[PDB]
Write a protein that binds this ligand. Structure first.
Ligand SMILES: [Fe+3]
Ligand SMILES: [Fe+3]
Lengths: 197, 197
């Protein structure tokens, strides 16, 4: 039973106190996120070769509907880890310095990331990524199930899901208020560990 | 103040007895549909030439965010017309015959359209269109704000919005159930009129 996903890092109701409700997290994880696993497992049932590949291996090598499934699996995993009930505020140490050295300031990064997340048209993802050659951090968008892992030199640090299902239950059309909530839950512990390796 | 949209053909609660609630229609129309109009009016404020263009002219000639706004305006206008509190069932007369002449049967058409609507990944639109050269009817998908008017010989007949905001209030993740509701409100009167010209 080929593919699985980790449990939510902080439980179904983990972000309720900070603006992402138990109901919002339940539909998103149980229906959307697990739905991809379900569909991937069905594809894997008749293809032993596919079943033996990691989600990351699939993202790097596959195309079409099967790519979208693995990509969405990784993106959602990374999304839940990008948030915490103890998130928010600004980072410190290595990451905070790197943000300054790439964006000029935290405020400027926050502006660019907000503008990317709020401005994305249709279904997609706002990322903080690092260029592994230059070591520069950048804001980076993907559309639909796009994933920075398909680009040779990009290492994801953080992501915010901006598909409508990520926020529709709590925020309806109001994605700006959702993104403001993302800033209150953003997990700098996870981001720092991604940055460091 | 340059652009406007028609009122809902059948009122905010018009489809509530057939599976699309007042709430769902209110957010879709008041927030999403009218939101495009507001954003297009802001672009038109400083650009008298754009302000004097029809939405269809913009769809055929402009590119980028301004295209997306006009195309979404047209597409949503067409969507509301594509439904009716008196819709559902099967067409009659000229359109019913043309459906048979293009798909082999109404059932086959319905299967193909349902598969398109349900299967569309990310944000988009399922359409019935006519090729104005061959006269043949086809199921045709657009992604994001894509609009059949950008292709020379396609005339739209009907559309179902499959952006998550179109169904998320009433149906959450369950797009299949939403598409089944679409079949109960589909407006053959609008379809027939688009077909005949
Ligand atoms: Fe999602
Ligand atoms: Fe819509």
């Amino acid at each position: 039973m080929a593919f699985s996903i980790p449990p939510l890092p902080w439980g179904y109701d983990g972000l309720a106190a900070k603006g992402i409700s138990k109901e919002q997290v339940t539909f998103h994880y149980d229906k959307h996120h697990m739905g991809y696993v379900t569909k991937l497992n069905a594809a894997a049932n008749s293809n032993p070769a596919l079943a033996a590949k990691s989600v990351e291996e699939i993202i790097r090598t596959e195309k079409g509907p099967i790519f979208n499934l693995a990509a969405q699996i990784f993106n959602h995993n990374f999304y839940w880890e990008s948030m915490s009930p103890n998130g928010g505020g600004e980072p410190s140490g290595k990451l905070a310095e790197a943000i300054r050295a790439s964006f000029g300031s935290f405020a400027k990064f926050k502006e660019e990331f907000t503008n990317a997340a709020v401005g994305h048209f249709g279904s997609g993802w706002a990322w903080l990524v690092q260029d592994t050659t230059t070591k520069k951090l950048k804001v980076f968008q993907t559309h639909d199930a796009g994933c920075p892992l398909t680009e040779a030199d990009l290492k994801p640090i953080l992501t915010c899901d901006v598909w409508e299902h990520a926020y529709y239950i709590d925020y309806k059309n109001d994605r700006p208020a959702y993104v403001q909530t993302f800033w209150n839950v953003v997990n700098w512990d996870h981001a720092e560990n991604q940055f460091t390796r």
